Amino acid sequence: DIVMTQSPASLAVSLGQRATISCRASQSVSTSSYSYMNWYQQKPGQPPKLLIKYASNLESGVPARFSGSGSGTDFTLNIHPLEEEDTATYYCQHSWEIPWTFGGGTKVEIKRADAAPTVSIFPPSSEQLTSGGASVVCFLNNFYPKDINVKWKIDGSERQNGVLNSWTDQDSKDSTYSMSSTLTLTKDEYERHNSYTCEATHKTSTSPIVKSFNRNEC
């Protein structure tokens, strides 16, 4: 059965520029008159959406900045001019035979001006403390590029365990990324210490952005 290889796996392209995706089929997928290749757009947290059918036929309502071409074993999706909302994963699939299969997908991301994260720290809610837990949360929002390091410091000394992080997918409006660090301790340990710090290291500055609070102090 037919295998499809998309490339690149990941693509970063400046606004208004041209994004180009390719899709190789393990065997030919077209007759003398039609090619049986489809293209889909999947934005994060959404189902796939049909853009192109039969290699080049734009589905009703889809913007003309999307275009498809190719034939035989090689097919291409083009996005020009690339716009902010176009950040998504793009899939090809054939309808040449059963089983229908999909390519592995290509993630298209917008390349933009570097930006520093807006950093916010949050002590455990009193409601959580009541139940015996203590979570210190730190939001690092609207930065670029997506690579960023977070360090937790308790009374000066760095902590690594009990942390878990999560990244936002590229924002469809401003093309930034965000992420969320959560340091989880027991109420018992939390109360034994005073100063809590999350430090954000990012290309944007040599100096980490740091936020702090002292427990039970204001």
Binding site: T118, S120, V137, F139, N141, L164, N165, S166, W167, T168, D169, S178, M179, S180, T182
Partner: peptide
């Protein structure tokens, strides 16, 4: 709004959301 993807840790999920 920034609602962050859930993370599994010991058969429990943790999710958070930010709003400015």
């Amino acid at each position: 709004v920034h609602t962050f993807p859930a993370v599994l840790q010991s058969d429990l999920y943790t999710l958070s959301s930010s709003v400015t």
